[PDB]
Amino acid sequence: AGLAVELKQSTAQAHEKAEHSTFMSDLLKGRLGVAEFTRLQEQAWLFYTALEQAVDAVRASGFAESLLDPALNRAEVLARDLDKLNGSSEWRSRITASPAVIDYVNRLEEIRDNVDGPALVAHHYVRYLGNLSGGQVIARMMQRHYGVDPEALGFYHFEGIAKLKVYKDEYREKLNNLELSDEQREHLLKEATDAFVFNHQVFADLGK
Numbered sequence: 001a002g003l004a005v006e007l008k009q010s011t012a013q014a015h016e017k018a019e020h021s022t023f024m025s026d027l028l029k030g031r032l033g034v035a036e037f038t039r040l041q042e043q044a045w046l047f048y049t050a051l052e053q054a055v056d057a058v059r060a061s062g063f064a065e066s067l068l069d070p071a072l073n074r075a076e077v078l079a080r081d082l083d084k085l086n087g088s089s090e091w092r093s094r095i096t097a098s099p100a101v102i103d104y105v106n107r108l109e110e111i112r113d114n115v116d117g118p119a120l121v122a123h124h125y126v127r128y129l130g131n132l133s134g135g136q137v138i139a140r141m142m143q144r145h146y147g148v149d150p151e152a153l154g155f156y157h158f159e160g161i162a163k164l165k166v167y168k169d170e171y172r173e174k175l176n177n178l179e180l181s182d183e184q185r186e187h188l189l190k191e192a193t194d195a196f197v198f199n200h201q202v203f204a205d206l207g208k
């Protein structure tokens with residue numbers, strides 16, 4: 001039972017922990033506010049920027065090309081959302097990576113500079129399949145609990161992909177068809193675990 005399934009199984013426990021961080025739990029249940037959502041999206045712009053440099057490098061190397069669809073790119077969409085949420089472009093010169101984000105960005109830059117395809121695919125799975133798959137729930141809760149304008153929720157929209165359910169199915173088939181060795185597969189799986197570890201610390205730092 002192939003890679004897509006093994007990824008899901010392998011990270012299922014971490015995914016469930018992710019739903020329950022104090023920050024995310026509090027956010028989704030209405031206990032926070034648009035300001036806290038904006039702080040999250042600012043950190044996310046930082047790590048999606050880094051992620052997408054690593055994706056560009058890996059795609060250019062010819063690994064997992066069809067998986068690494070540039071239509072998934074989130075950083076510029078995020079910046080447009082952040083221009084709406086903050087009311088201006090002034091965030092870019094005020095924002096600072098949290099310590100958790102420094103660690104995560106450093107890993108992403110390591111993957112980039114090593115052109116580590118298997119490692120990159122792990123982080124691509126955790127970031128993009130998560131959004132493609134469940135981001136709509138988060139966006140609905142930001143609208144319903146805090147009145148965020150959907151124009152500021154572009155991050156969750158995948159402009160340019162129509163049929164998201166089919167896209168998800170195809171994304172999994174690409175994972176299943178990747179040519180990996182036993183060593184590349186274990187590295188990818190470990191990395192997907194580490195990805196959830198990084199995300200957990202980002203949320204913890206947001207919650208402080």
Ligand code: HEM
Binds near residue numbers: 129133137
């Ligand atoms: C820590 C931030 C999160 C990350 C990195 C993340 C990651 C992911 C990933 C990788 C998937 C794909 C699982 C798979 O099918 O292989 C996924 C799916 C999903 N996530 Fe999240 N998730 C996060 C938080 C959340 C939250 C807070 C919710 C709200 C309940 C949520 C709801 C869902 C839903 C409904 C799916 C679709 C079913 C699935 O693909 O398994 N996620 N998420």
